[PDB]
Design a binder for this molecule. Structure first.
Ligand SMILES: O=c1[nH]cc(F)c(=O)[nH]1
Ligand SMILES: [Cl-]
Length: 224
């Protein structure tokens, strides 16, 4: 399938260099199914982040891999469906840092769609995972697709802030070495890493000051 049938047109243009890789991933996933091994998130949500316009991304959030628990991952990193409770612990932790940093009330739910609609790309280094098996699709081919996405964001040389959460940070910073691109890192917000540097990192207000510094408009982070 042409990418323009799976992603927004600007993204289809940016990722055409890895279009065969994206097809190989779809082959890989269908092969996993044929072998009885499922993947998350849903096939139609795998490239969901690439359904919001390439040309409008001003903040790039990059995590590691999707939620491994069925019913959580939705193709926007860290987000959940609006009816989901309890929130996953990574999301709960992001929302405590959100209230500490911004002084906003806790969000009504865990649906981060409003961030995606406002120019925040919620990306993961690896876009699929096997249920109950964290990080189980590492090394399987998504890295070349997400490296293409990131470099192509940086090559626009429009103002861009990347928020890098967790262990891929030192790999991803060289990909963001370009004019009008700034990368800020912390430990990941998951249970056992968040209290080791995620909390206290103030990535929301920092991103907005870096944007304004470049002459860009800040993000309205406020969730309902
Ligand atoms: O690194 C991640 N952890 C948890 C997530 F939900 C996600 O999308 N990415
Ligand atoms: Cl989690």
């Amino acid at each position: 399938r042409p990418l323009s049938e799976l992603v927004e047109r600007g993204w289809a243009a940016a990722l055409e260099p890895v279009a065969d890789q994206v097809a190989h991933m779809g082959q890989f996933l269908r092969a996993e199914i044929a072998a009885g091994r499922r993947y998350l998130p849903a096939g139609s949500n795998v490239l969901r982040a690439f359904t919001f316009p390439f040309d409008n991304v001003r903040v790039l959030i990059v995590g590691q891999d999707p939620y491994p628990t069925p019913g959580h991952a939705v193709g926007l990193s860290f987000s959940v469906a609006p009816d989901v409770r309890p929130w996953p612990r990574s999301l709960a932790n992001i929302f405590d840092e959100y209230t500490a940093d911004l002084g906003y009330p806790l969000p009504s739910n865990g649906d981060l769609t409003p961030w995606a609609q406002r120019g925040v790309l919620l990306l993961n280094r690896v876009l699929t995972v096997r249920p109950s098996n964290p990080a189980s699709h590492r090394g399987k081919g998504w890295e070349a697709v997400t490296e293409c996405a990131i470099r192509a964001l940086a090559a626009r040389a429009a103002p861009l802030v990347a928020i890098l959460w967790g262990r891929d940070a030192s790999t991803l910073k060289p990909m963001l070495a370009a004019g009008n691109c700034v990368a800020i890192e912390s430990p990941h917000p998951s249970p056992l890493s968040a209290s080791r540097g995620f909390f206290g990192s103030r990535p929301f207000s920092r991103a907005n000051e870096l944007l304004v510094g470049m002459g860009a408009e800040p993000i309205d982070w406020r969730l309902p």
